[PDB]
Design a protein around this ligand. Structure first.
Ligand SMILES: C[N+](C)(C)CCOP(=O)(O)O
Ligand SMILES: [Ca+2]
Ligand SMILES: [Ca+2]
Ligand SMILES: [Zn+2]
Ligand SMILES: [Zn+2]
Length: 540
């Protein structure tokens, strides 16, 4: 007849892989996935702990591109948002979209962290999933989580849409069947219009037999979105592509088909088949766009406005805060940790630079200085010395720096004075360094060995002898070792020959032992205490 047109916009990545797809049909708009969003959980909420691999790079955020395309299309409302799975690069902008546009319904299969067998593949799935459910209820939007056969087949404008892999698969106890990764759970969408079929399968893989199962059921299509961006290890199996036999494959990725490197053999196998393969990646246009005509798909991408220019660098908001647009971005702003000209800066999820504050991140403490730059090496904060390692983490415990040892307390604060560490005693200077050798604390001397350990008992250093008491304190004056008396001088050193103590003269032998009841080398007499009997005449 005469509708206003049928189009599909695959939002272009800057790099990496992410799915956001706009369906346009006779003035109706809907989305299949929504791309990566700026937002992410920082670990401050125990429900959504920080996990290695959660996306924080502006290079992977599709938010600007999604909302620019919708605005450029004069979208007033979305008939539906379909979410294929809970990965941030698919579900990311759903809540932002629900906050921005009226939405009639969201398709969202059940998820829980428990149904994923691998701890290492949880990331921020639940955070993204909860955002959809929470924001949908807050904006009045029905979430279809229990898709019936009836639900699975519906009209959208001129488009006929059929879903596959839509059921929640459960065990005897009604809890979700376990899978290796949420990719296996991908909600499949097949779109029919103007005699053309388009397959849209999110990150579908064959680990739990999904490609084996749905290949034969889906059958011949024209345009196939590649499953899972670029992967050929577990997705896009030969049987699946033979079953669908597309003339055109669109990858939502800047990468070639990939399996530990370019999968050149798979690339060639696709060519031998006459399949056209296109990457939805661009620095210049928000989307790879096809006009879906009876006589074929027309690439109309460049018929839209190019991405606007931007001024790179640091920018100051109206409220005095800082945000940043990297010169290698296409306008997307920095969030989370970002290395900028040799310093590390942390930006919150809305893109604001944090300054002059402690920040806990992935179980370590960081201090963001005046400029925002994370502290490195010694830093004095609120009157206390702290030490930050080469990775900006506040150190605790023993730290070696510039050929000296330091100890940082449990709260990061530098230790000075006495420390009992692992059953032994150490002493740190007021400037923090662990002291070796002779150290004066208050009005007592102590002797620490080469490793800083306070010594006890008799010692010899540089030809002189000292006695350290059990507490470590250097002895001064009289000391009995076994059956002999010794005298330690003011400097601690063991005396030899004649010494004067308390107006009496005492003779210490070669070996430091006190002569008692006998004659000195010159023939003087000493009493039982070793004191010289002054009245007794010299006698040789
Ligand atoms: C969630 N994630 C983006 C960190 C992992 C990658 O997800 P996927 O697109 O490879 O399935
Ligand atoms: Ca995100
Ligand atoms: Ca979001
Ligand atoms: Zn993905
Ligand atoms: Zn995925």
């Amino acid at each position: 007849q005469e509708s206003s047109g049928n189009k599909i916009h695959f939002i272009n990545v800057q790099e990496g892989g992410s799915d956001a797809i706009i369906l346009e049909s006779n003035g109706h708009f809907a989305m299949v996935d929504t791309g990566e969003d700026y937002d992410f959980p920082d670990g401050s909420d125990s429900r959504y702990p920080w996990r290695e691999g959660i996306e924080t790079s502006y290079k992977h955020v599709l938010t600007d591109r999604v909302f620019r395309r919708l605005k450029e299309l004069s979208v007033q409302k979305l008939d539906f948002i379909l979410v294929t799975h809970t990965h941030s690069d698919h579900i990311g902008n759903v809540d932002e979209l629900l906050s921005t546009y009226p939405v009639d319904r969201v398709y969202l299969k059940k998820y829980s962290d428990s149904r994923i067998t691998n701890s290492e593949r949880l990331w921020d799935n639940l955070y993204g999933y909860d955002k959809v459910l929470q924001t949908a209820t807050e904006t009045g939007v029905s979430v279809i989580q229990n898709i019936t056969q009836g639900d699975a087949h519906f009209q959208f404008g001129d488009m006929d849409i059929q879903l596959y892999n839509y059921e929640n698969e459960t065990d005897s106890s009604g809890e979700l069947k376990k899978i290796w990764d949420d990719n296996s759970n991908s909600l499949i969408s097949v779109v029919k219009v103007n005699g053309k079929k388009i397959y849209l399968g999110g990150d579908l893989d064959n680990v739990h037999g999904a490609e084996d199962k749905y290949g034969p059921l889906i059958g011949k299509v024209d345009l196939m979105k590649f499953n899972h961006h670029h992967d050929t290890n577990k997705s896009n199996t030969k049987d699946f592509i033979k079953n669908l036999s597309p003339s055109l494959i669109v990858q939502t990725s800047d990468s070639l088909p990939w399996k530990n490197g370019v999968d050149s053999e798979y690339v060639n196998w696709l060519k031998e088949r006459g399949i056209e393969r296109i990457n939805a990646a661009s620095k210049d246009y928000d989307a790879t766009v096809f006009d879906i005509r009876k006589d074929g798909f027309v690439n109309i991408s460049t018929s839209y406005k190019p991405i606007p220019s931007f001024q790179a660098g640091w920018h100051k908001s109206a409220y005095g805060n800082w945000w940043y647009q990297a010169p290698d971005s296409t306008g997307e702003y920095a969030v989370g940790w970002n290395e900028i000209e040799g310093e590390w800066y942390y930006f919150n999820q809305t893109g604001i630079l944090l300054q002059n504050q402690w920040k806990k991140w992935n179980n370590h403490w960081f201090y963001l200085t005046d400029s925002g730059a994370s502290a490195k090496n010694w830093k004095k904060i609120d009157g206390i010395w702290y030490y930050f390692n080469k990775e900006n983490q506040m150190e605790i415990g023993w730290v070696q720096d510039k050929e000296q040892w330091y100890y940082l307390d449990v709260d990061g604060s530098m230790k000075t004075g006495w420390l009992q560490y692992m059953g032994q005693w150490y002493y740190f200077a007021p400037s923090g360094e662990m002291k070796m050798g002779w150290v004066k604390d208050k009005e007592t001397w102590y002797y620490m060995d080469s490793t800083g350990v306070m010594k006890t008992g008799e010692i010899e250093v540089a030809g002189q002898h000292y006695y350290l008491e059990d507490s470590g304190a250097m002895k001064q004056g009289w000391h009995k070792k076994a059956n002999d008396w010794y005298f330690y001088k003011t400097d601690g050193s063991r005396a030899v020959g004649w010494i004067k103590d308390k107006d009496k003269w005492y003779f210490l032998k070669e070996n430091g032992q006190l002569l008692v009841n006998g004659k000195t080398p010159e023939g003087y007499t000493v009493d039982s205490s070793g004191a010289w009997l002054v009245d007794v005449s010299i006698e040789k």
